[PDB]
Write an enzyme that holds these catalytic residues in place. Structure first.
Site, PDB file in Angstrom:
ATOM      1  N   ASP A  90      32.391   6.132  90.503  1.00  0.00           N
ATOM      2  CA  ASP A  90      33.739   6.599  90.930  1.00  0.00           C
ATOM      3  C   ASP A  90      34.927   5.462  90.126  1.00  0.00           C
ATOM      4  O   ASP A  90      35.758   5.259  90.762  1.00  0.00           O
ATOM      5  CB  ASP A  90      34.033   6.684  92.212  1.00  0.00           C
ATOM      6  CG  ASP A  90      34.960   7.447  92.893  1.00  0.00           C
ATOM      7  OD1 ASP A  90      35.629   8.127  91.828  1.00  0.00           O
ATOM      8  OD2 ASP A  90      35.501   7.647  93.746  1.00  0.00           O
ATOM      9  N   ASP A 144      35.859   0.117  95.396  1.00  0.00           N
ATOM     10  CA  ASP A 144      35.421   1.704  95.765  1.00  0.00           C
ATOM     11  C   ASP A 144      35.658   1.775  97.130  1.00  0.00           C
ATOM     12  O   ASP A 144      34.747   1.491  98.218  1.00  0.00           O
ATOM     13  CB  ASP A 144      33.792   1.872  95.552  1.00  0.00           C
ATOM     14  CG  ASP A 144      33.621   3.291  95.836  1.00  0.00           C
ATOM     15  OD1 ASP A 144      32.377   3.555  95.427  1.00  0.00           O
ATOM     16  OD2 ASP A 144      34.482   4.106  96.050  1.00  0.00           O
ATOM     17  N   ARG A 185      42.264   5.110  90.514  1.00  0.00           N
ATOM     18  CA  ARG A 185      42.725   5.085  92.046  1.00  0.00           C
ATOM     19  C   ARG A 185      42.040   4.214  92.717  1.00  0.00           C
ATOM     20  O   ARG A 185      42.104   3.590  93.661  1.00  0.00           O
ATOM     21  CB  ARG A 185      42.581   6.539  92.746  1.00  0.00           C
ATOM     22  CG  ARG A 185      41.105   6.889  92.437  1.00  0.00           C
ATOM     23  CD  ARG A 185      40.827   8.264  93.148  1.00  0.00           C
ATOM     24  NE  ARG A 185      39.448   8.866  92.786  1.00  0.00           N
ATOM     25  CZ  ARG A 185      39.287   9.457  91.613  1.00  0.00           C
ATOM     26  NH1 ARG A 185      40.527   9.765  90.701  1.00  0.00           N
ATOM     27  NH2 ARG A 185      38.252   9.862  91.255  1.00  0.00           N
ATOM     28  N   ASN A 186      40.868   3.714  92.152  1.00  0.00           N
ATOM     29  CA  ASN A 186      39.775   2.771  92.691  1.00  0.00           C
ATOM     30  C   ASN A 186      40.057   1.223  91.883  1.00  0.00           C
ATOM     31  O   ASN A 186      39.404   0.369  92.302  1.00  0.00           O
ATOM     32  CB  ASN A 186      38.473   3.101  92.570  1.00  0.00           C
ATOM     33  CG  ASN A 186      38.046   4.182  93.469  1.00  0.00           C
ATOM     34  OD1 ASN A 186      38.582   4.085  94.502  1.00  0.00           O
ATOM     35  ND2 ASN A 186      37.287   5.057  93.176  1.00  0.00           N
ATOM     36  N   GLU A 200      41.416  10.011 107.628  1.00  0.00           N
ATOM     37  CA  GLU A 200      40.479  10.214 108.546  1.00  0.00           C
ATOM     38  C   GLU A 200      39.535   9.329 108.528  1.00  0.00           C
ATOM     39  O   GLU A 200      38.542   9.224 109.515  1.00  0.00           O
ATOM     40  CB  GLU A 200      40.013  11.455 108.226  1.00  0.00           C
ATOM     41  CG  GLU A 200      38.954  12.136 109.183  1.00  0.00           C
ATOM     42  CD  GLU A 200      38.573  13.561 109.109  1.00  0.00           C
ATOM     43  OE1 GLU A 200      38.996  14.274 107.997  1.00  0.00           O
ATOM     44  OE2 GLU A 200      37.632  14.110 109.860  1.00  0.00           O
ATOM     45  N   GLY A 239      48.264   2.113 104.970  1.00  0.00           N
ATOM     46  CA  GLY A 239      47.614   3.588 104.777  1.00  0.00           C
ATOM     47  C   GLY A 239      46.660   3.934 105.826  1.00  0.00           C
ATOM     48  O   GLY A 239      46.466   3.127 106.815  1.00  0.00           O
ATOM     49  N   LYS A 258      40.668  -2.907 106.742  1.00  0.00           N
ATOM     50  CA  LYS A 258      40.302  -1.588 106.879  1.00  0.00           C
ATOM     51  C   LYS A 258      39.480  -1.413 108.070  1.00  0.00           C
ATOM     52  O   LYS A 258      38.621  -1.915 108.409  1.00  0.00           O
ATOM     53  CB  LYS A 258      39.283  -1.036 105.564  1.00  0.00           C
ATOM     54  CG  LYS A 258      38.756   0.178 105.526  1.00  0.00           C
ATOM     55  CD  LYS A 258      37.693   0.412 104.780  1.00  0.00           C
ATOM     56  CE  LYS A 258      36.893   1.681 104.591  1.00  0.00           C
ATOM     57  NZ  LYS A 258      35.676   1.586 103.726  1.00  0.00           N
TER      58      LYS A 258
HETATM   59  C1  LIG Z   1      46.640   1.155 101.021  1.00  0.00           C
HETATM   60  O1  LIG Z   1      47.494   0.111 100.352  1.00  0.00           O
HETATM   61  C2  LIG Z   1      46.859  -1.105 100.030  1.00  0.00           C
HETATM   62  C3  LIG Z   1      45.404  -1.185 100.422  1.00  0.00           C
HETATM   63  C4  LIG Z   1      44.729  -2.219 100.030  1.00  0.00           C
HETATM   64  C5  LIG Z   1      43.563  -2.419 100.105  1.00  0.00           C
HETATM   65  O2  LIG Z   1      42.589  -1.312 100.666  1.00  0.00           O
HETATM   66  C6  LIG Z   1      41.198  -1.361 100.408  1.00  0.00           C
HETATM   67  C7  LIG Z   1      40.684  -0.926  99.121  1.00  0.00           C
HETATM   68  C8  LIG Z   1      39.369  -0.932  98.835  1.00  0.00           C
HETATM   69  C9  LIG Z   1      38.539  -1.381  99.937  1.00  0.00           C
HETATM   70  N1  LIG Z   1      37.204  -1.287  99.667  1.00  0.00           N
HETATM   71  C10 LIG Z   1      36.000  -1.208 100.674  1.00  0.00           C
HETATM   72  O3  LIG Z   1      36.388  -0.920 101.686  1.00  0.00           O
HETATM   73  C11 LIG Z   1      34.670  -1.169 100.083  1.00  0.00           C
HETATM   74  C12 LIG Z   1      34.566  -1.381  98.401  1.00  0.00           C
HETATM   75  O4  LIG Z   1      35.573  -1.691  97.857  1.00  0.00           O
HETATM   76  N2  LIG Z   1      33.291  -1.675  98.027  1.00  0.00           N
HETATM   77  C13 LIG Z   1      33.102  -2.031  96.815  1.00  0.00           C
HETATM   78  C14 LIG Z   1      32.150  -1.100  95.975  1.00  0.00           C
HETATM   79  C15 LIG Z   1      31.811  -1.406  94.738  1.00  0.00           C
HETATM   80  C16 LIG Z   1      32.500  -2.428  93.890  1.00  0.00           C
HETATM   81  F1  LIG Z   1      32.283  -2.692  92.647  1.00  0.00           F
HETATM   82  C17 LIG Z   1      33.460  -3.135  94.579  1.00  0.00           C
HETATM   83  C18 LIG Z   1      33.779  -2.945  95.883  1.00  0.00           C
HETATM   84  C19 LIG Z   1      33.712  -0.148 100.597  1.00  0.00           C
HETATM   85  C20 LIG Z   1      33.582  -1.598 100.989  1.00  0.00           C
HETATM   86  C21 LIG Z   1      38.928  -1.668 101.173  1.00  0.00           C
HETATM   87  C22 LIG Z   1      40.421  -1.783 101.605  1.00  0.00           C
HETATM   88  F2  LIG Z   1      41.115  -2.235 102.549  1.00  0.00           F
HETATM   89  C23 LIG Z   1      42.700  -3.606  99.905  1.00  0.00           C
HETATM   90  C24 LIG Z   1      43.518  -4.726  99.181  1.00  0.00           C
HETATM   91  N3  LIG Z   1      44.846  -4.498  98.895  1.00  0.00           N
HETATM   92  C25 LIG Z   1      45.426  -3.287  99.275  1.00  0.00           C
HETATM   93  C26 LIG Z   1      46.600  -3.183  98.980  1.00  0.00           C
HETATM   94  C27 LIG Z   1      47.307  -2.006  99.482  1.00  0.00           C
HETATM   95  O5  LIG Z   1      48.745  -1.586  99.546  1.00  0.00           O
HETATM   96  C28 LIG Z   1      49.599  -2.876  98.909  1.00  0.00           C
HETATM   97  C29 LIG Z   1      50.822  -2.481  99.096  1.00  0.00           C
HETATM   98  C30 LIG Z   1      51.156  -1.382  97.864  1.00  0.00           C
HETATM   99  N4  LIG Z   1      52.671  -1.066  97.930  1.00  0.00           N
HETATM  100  C31 LIG Z   1      53.126  -0.440  96.462  1.00  0.00           C
HETATM  101  C32 LIG Z   1      54.516   0.045  96.525  1.00  0.00           C
HETATM  102  O6  LIG Z   1      54.599   1.097  97.383  1.00  0.00           O
HETATM  103  C33 LIG Z   1      54.480   0.726  98.696  1.00  0.00           C
HETATM  104  C34 LIG Z   1      53.028   0.196  98.914  1.00  0.00           C
END
Ligand SMILES: COc1cc2c(Oc3ccc(NC(=O)C4(C(=O)Nc5ccc(F)cc5)CC4)cc3F)ccnc2cc1OCCCN1CCOCC1
Length: 269
Positions: A131, A149, A135-136, A19, A16, A38
């Protein structure tokens, strides 16, 4: 917050980008573990670097089955990295649309129970999400749903020289309780309103809430007493739970603890 040694991480594939920067699938080295990675966009300000790392520190405080796990960060080298557990099926809203019709009601209610259990944990930590939206929510290969998030509400397209800037993040109007839209009174009870919207996203296999309405059109409808309609094949008990989450008075909404218990009882009956 654990600092991970760069020799322990390999980035394999960008999955993914935007910006903010990018998200990669990678491995973390014990046998190696798949991770999401990330990164921070090149050219970040010191505020952005601090905020980036501050969000990882927030996430690292939590330890729950239904909350995305932070493996650690790379802050001492470039590119900086937030390294999380990997969620094979990605975001819930996209996942449900791809799997339209393919789940039993019991399976959908099980997803909602997992999300509620993560939120109950957050609420017990005095953490307000603000939020909460499909989507989250991330989904792993066993269909376990976990709260995250990514920070979409805190990406700002403000000109660096603009006189007026967004303060305190943008709000997701279609997911936000009325007292939080009006008075910025964000509480676990406003998160519970958001949970009801998530319940509707889930039972509709990822329909956009109020999709036929502009943002102002949405706020008018809600204020006129409109509520999202009963999705086809939504059990009456689940829609009643939705409606309780959408009570105008936040004091009348169930607690996340209650939601977990209500869902548990339905699942066993
Ligand atoms: C873009 O695709 C993906 C992104 C992913 C992912 O991304 C993140 C999500 C959240 C955070 N959070 C954060 O950076 C933070 C956060 O979450 N803080 C936070 C705050 C409050 C809370 F309660 C919990 C966490 C900011 C730190 C960081 C990430 F890197 C994390 C884990 N697995 C992922 C799998 C993905 O695709 C899998 C493949 C899917 N396929 C489906 C079929 O089509 C093809 C693709």
């Amino acid at each position: 917050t654990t600092e991970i040694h760069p020799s322990c991480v390999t980035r394999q594939k960008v999955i993914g980008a935007g910006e903010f920067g990018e998200v990669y699938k990678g491995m973390l080295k014990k046998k190696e573990v798949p991770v999401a990675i990330k990164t921070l966009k090149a050219g970040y300000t010191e505020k952005q670097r601090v905020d980036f790392l501050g969000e990882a520190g927030i996430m690292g405080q939590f330890s729950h089955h239904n909350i995305i796990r932070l493996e650690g960060v790379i802050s001492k080298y470039k590119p900086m990295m937030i390294i999380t557990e990997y969620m094979e099926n990605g975001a819930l809203d996209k996942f449900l649309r791809e799997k339209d019709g393919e789940f039993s009601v019991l399976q959908l209610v099980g997803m909602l129970r997992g999300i509620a259990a993560g939120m109950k944990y957050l609420a017990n930590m005095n953490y307000v999400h603000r939020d909460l939206a499909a989507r989250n929510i991330l989904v792993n290969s066993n269909l376990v749903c976990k709260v995250s998030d990514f920070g979409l509400s805190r990406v700002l397209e403000d000109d660096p020289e603009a006189t007026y800037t967004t303060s305190g993040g943008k709000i997701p109007i279609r997911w936000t309780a009325p007292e939080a839209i009006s008075y910025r009174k964000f509480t676990s009870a406003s998160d519970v309103w958001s949970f009801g919207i998530v319940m509707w996203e889930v039972m509709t296999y990822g329909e956009r809430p109020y999709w036929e309405l502009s943002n102002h059109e949405v706020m008018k409808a809600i204020n006129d007493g409109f509520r999202l309609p009963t999705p086809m094949d939504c059990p009456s008990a689940i829609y009643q739970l939705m409606m309780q989450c959408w009570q105008q008075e936040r004091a009348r909404r169930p607690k996340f603890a209650d939601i977990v218990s209500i869902l548990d009882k339905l699942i066993r009956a």
